[PDB]
């Protein structure tokens, strides 16, 4: 390398074996990505089919039980275990895979292997962008899903009492986690969450509107009403009219893009900033740093019965969520709340 | 144009004089890998200790250790 002799070694042979065109690019990162990702996905598909949740949560979350796709999950282990790593060789399982499954070790397996699969995929993005000699903006974009994953499935349970309060991997379990964040954390009111919402909805707007604008400002290249056959792989002219697109959105919306590079950098920038803000807010919620209350409006509502707002209605709904979900969601607290003391409106 | 000649700069010139010069091939990369993997084992030891997935006879790993 670089006008030197540099006699070949086992590293160079392995590198040349890995960095070559195949059906699937393996690479050095594939030494991590392929097994860790396969184990995370297969463990999730195994837990959703056979591994029970009767002992960790007192619920049912597998197809062998009778749950379908929307309801089955790989459940977080018991709060008693705290933040234990739930190694199969560790203290809780003691080498025994069978009672390891029912103690909740599969959640720790899926979480750790999914994190290392995500690392392997971003390293794969770096590696492939290097081999094709392209800028690593795809890996910079993928930095935001890993930020969300670590803040949600790792930082938040580490901040709370244990892995039990992490999201269990499964559709209805994610919905439980979401309604949990509504009732206990008021995650709707959090400015970082609403920055994440603005980022995701704006990214969807950009995706849809770039697609429609491009698909409606094409150049002809025609002699056929199917426009999809007017595209050739290797040429040097624009396929849709940039100036017509800029004119259209300038007269419809008032402002319009005129730089393709800044347009696509904005399409890159919006979801990454949104997901990073959501990650920061979840990190705040890991320590119970909520934007639950407005002190001025709460003291006004306490000193005036006549003050009623949608925010106060939300606060009441959150009390209802917490008190009606705590007994069945948190078995570790042994919360046997009688029917007497639960909050309740008139009728219903 | 040569820069500013300095007594303390000429003092510290030899420590930063031989920029960009290396050893051929791999050198001490194998011993570096031994250092990496021993550090990983040690760091995973203390991680499991503070997570108490590894129990030792003397390590209480709780606040009573301050006693």
């Amino acid at each position: 390398i670089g006008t030197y002799q540099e006699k070949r070694t086992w590293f160079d042979d392995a590198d040349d074996w890995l960095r070559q065109d195949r059906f699937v690019f393996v690479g050095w990162s594939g030494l991590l990505l392929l097994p860790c990702a396969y184990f995370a996905v297969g463990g999730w598909l195994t837990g959703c089919t056979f591994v029970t949740s009767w002992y960790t949560h007192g619920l049912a979350s597998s197809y062998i039980e009778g749950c379908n796709f929307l309801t089955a999950a790989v459940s977080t282990p018991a709060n008693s275990l705290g933040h234990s790593l739930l190694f199969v060789w560790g203290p809780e399982a003691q080498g025994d895979l069978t009672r390891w499954f029912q103690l909740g070790g599969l959640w720790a397996f899926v979480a750790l292997h999914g994190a290392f699969g995500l690392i392997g995929f971003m390293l794969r993005q770096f590696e492939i962008a290097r081999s094709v000699n392209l800028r690593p903006y795809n890996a910079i974009a993928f930095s935001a899903p890993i930020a969300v994953f670590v803040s949600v499935f790792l930082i938040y349970p580490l901040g709370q009492s244990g892995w039990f309060f992490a999201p269990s991997f499964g559709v209805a379990s994610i919905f439980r986690f979401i309604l949990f964040f509504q009732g206990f954390h008021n995650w709707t009111l959090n400015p970082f969450h609403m920055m994440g919402v603005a980022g995701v909805l704006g990214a969807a707007l950009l995706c849809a509107i770039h697609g429609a604008t491009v698909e409606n400002t094409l150049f002809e290249d025609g002699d056929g009403a199917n426009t999809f056959r007017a595209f050739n792989p290797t040429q040097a002219e624009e396929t849709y009219s940039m100036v017509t697109a800029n004119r259209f959105w300038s007269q419809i919306f008032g402002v319009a893009f005129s730089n393709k590079r800044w347009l696509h950098f904005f399409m890159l920038f919006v979801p990454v900033t949104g997901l990073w803000m959501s990650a920061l807010g979840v990190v705040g919620l890991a320590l119970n740093l909520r934007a639950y209350d407005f002190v001025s409006q709460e003291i006004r509502a306490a000193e005036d019965p006549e003050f009623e707002t949608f925010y106060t209605k939300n606060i009441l709904l959150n009390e209802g969520i917490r008190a009606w979900m705590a007994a069945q969601d948190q078995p570790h607290e042994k919360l046997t709340l009688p029917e007497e003391v639960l909050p309740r409106g008139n009728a219903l | 144009e040569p820069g500013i000649v300095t007594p303390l700069g000429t003092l510290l010139r030899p420590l930063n004089s031989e920029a960009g010069k290396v050893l051929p091939g791999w050198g001490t990369t194998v011993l570096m890998a031994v250092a990496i993997l021993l550090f990983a084992v040690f760091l995973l030891i203390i991680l499991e200790i503070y997570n108490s997935s590894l129990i030792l006879d003397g390590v209480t790993n709780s606040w009573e250790s301050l006693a």
Binding site: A14, W17, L18, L31, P35, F87, W89, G90, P91, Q94, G95 | V41, I45, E48, S53, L54, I55, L56, D57
Partner: peptide
């Protein structure tokens, strides 16, 4: 003393070395 926690951890380190050796076998056996 060698706590059984230590024993399981050392055999797990052995197992990790085994997995790395098998990965080396997979990369050298094409």
């Amino acid at each position: 003393s060698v706590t059984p926690s230590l024993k399981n951890f050392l055999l797990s380190l052995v197992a990790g070395a085994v997995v790395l050796a098998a990965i080396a076998g997979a990369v050298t056996a094409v």
